[PDB]
Design an enzyme around this catalytic site. Structure first.
Site, short mmCIF file in Angstrom:
data_model
loop_
_atom_site.label_atom_id
_atom_site.label_comp_id
_atom_site.label_asym_id
_atom_site.label_seq_id
_atom_site.Cartn_x
_atom_site.Cartn_y
_atom_site.Cartn_z
CG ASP A 1 73.71 116.31 36.74
OD1 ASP A 1 72.95 115.36 37.03
OD2 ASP A 1 74.32 116.98 37.59
CG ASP B 1 70.93 111.98 29.35
OD1 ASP B 1 70.49 111.22 30.23
OD2 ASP B 1 71.05 111.63 28.15
CG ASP C 1 70.70 107.76 28.30
OD1 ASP C 1 71.24 106.97 27.50
OD2 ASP C 1 71.33 108.33 29.21
NE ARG D 1 75.03 103.07 31.04
CZ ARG D 1 74.72 104.15 31.75
NH1 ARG D 1 74.15 105.21 31.17
NH2 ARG D 1 74.98 104.19 33.05
#
Length: 330
Positions: A112, A114, A156, A207
């Site tokens: 969580d 982020d 993101d 990523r």
């Protein structure tokens, strides 16, 4: 101003900044805001990262996250020297948002945790977002019991966020840098239109970005010490990869781990020393741009004007300009 798909984003514009010294003050100011017309937040808090004596304490703790939900015309701007131990989330019917000059590090929450997250939902999808001159960092340490999630995403977006510029950011000591489309079922992400430029990606794992569906323009970024994979284009996504500077990077341009591959248009990339390649574990189809040959032509006009830094000069330019505390230098 923003260059790329996020062009024309003004956030809160010329509105008189509201000084917010804390996570809670920022949220309160967002909560009180009518939702349109303009809000500018000057974040002045100076989190001392030295107060975190154990990197592995973080994943166990609840996330600290500011939410901009169904509100538009917002600027979140870190003051010079400011630092945050909280993340930011832009969600739903939320448009014209700037996140700038924030230093975001070692967040609580694990999966969580982020840092900067943009997300569509049933109420709508964010658009015209400018994520600019931020510094985002954590740790590469894989904490006992944390699974794969000692920390979470850096910059993101998912579920159909469109028309975004991610520029002049500095992401380091970070496992999972940038997600674009959260799963192979995220078909709404075909609407994604993202420009990643002049970012600094150093001592990171993967990523960079992970792209599922949609179109992207990835140019003038500097990659160094990227240890698992770099640009990962998947699920029919196409990336125009132009004038970047690659060195000390494994799988710099690849398509892996999705049910269907993604494609790339490669031009003028500077390829330095320490490029390595690997084969992914699994059965799914993959591709490695070992010879730097384009797999698809970019299918449409970008619809914007941009100035390219000569690829060889990108390393120096990005080191000089990327991240927070750089006076938004370009």
């Amino acid at each position: 101003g923003p260059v790329g798909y996020g062009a024309g984003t003004t956030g809160g514009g010329n509105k008189v900044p509201v000084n917010v010294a804390t996570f809670e003050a920022m949220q309160s100011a967002i909560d009180s805001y009518s939702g349109s017309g303009g809000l500018v937040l000057n974040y002045t808090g100076k989190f001392d990262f030295g107060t975190i004596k154990d990197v592995c304490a973080q994943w166990k703790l609840p996330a600290k996250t500011v939410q901009i939900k169904n509100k538009s015309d917002v600027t979140i701007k870190g003051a010079n020297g400011s630092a945050a131990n909280f993340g930011i989330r832009v969600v739903g019917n939320a448009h014209n948002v700037i996140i700038q000059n924030m230093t975001i590090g070692l967040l609580q929450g694990g999966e969580d945790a982020d840092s900067i997250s943009l997300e569509g939902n049933s109420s709508g999808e964010p658009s015209k977002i400018w994520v600019d001159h931020n510094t985002v960092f954590a740790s590469l340490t894989k904490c006992s019991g944390a699974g794969d999630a000692s920390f979470d995403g850096g910059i993101d977006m998912k579920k159909g966020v469109h028309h975004v510029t991610v520029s002049y950011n500095y992401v380091y000591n970070y496992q999972k840098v940038a997600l674009n489309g959260y799963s192979d079922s995220d078909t709404k992400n075909s609407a994604a239109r993202t420009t990643y430029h002049h970012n600094r990606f150093e001592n990171v794992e993967s990523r960079v970005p992970l792209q599922r569906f949609g179109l992207s323009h990835i140019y003038n970024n500097y990659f160094n010490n990227v240890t698992t994979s770099g640009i990962n284009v998947r699920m029919g996504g196409i990336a125009k990869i132009e004038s970047n500077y690659f060195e000390n990077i494994k799988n710099p341009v690849t398509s892996r781990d999705s049910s269907e591959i993604g494609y790339w248009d490669l031009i003028n990339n500077y390829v330095g020393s320490g490029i390595t390649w690997g084969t992914p574990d699994g059965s799914k189809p993959y591709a490695n741009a070992t010879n730097w040959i384009s797999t698809k032509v970019f299918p449409e006009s970008l619809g914007y004007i941009y100035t390219v830094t000569p690829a060889a000069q990108v390393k120096a330019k990005v080191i000089a300009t990327a991240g927070a505390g750089k006076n938004l230098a370009e």
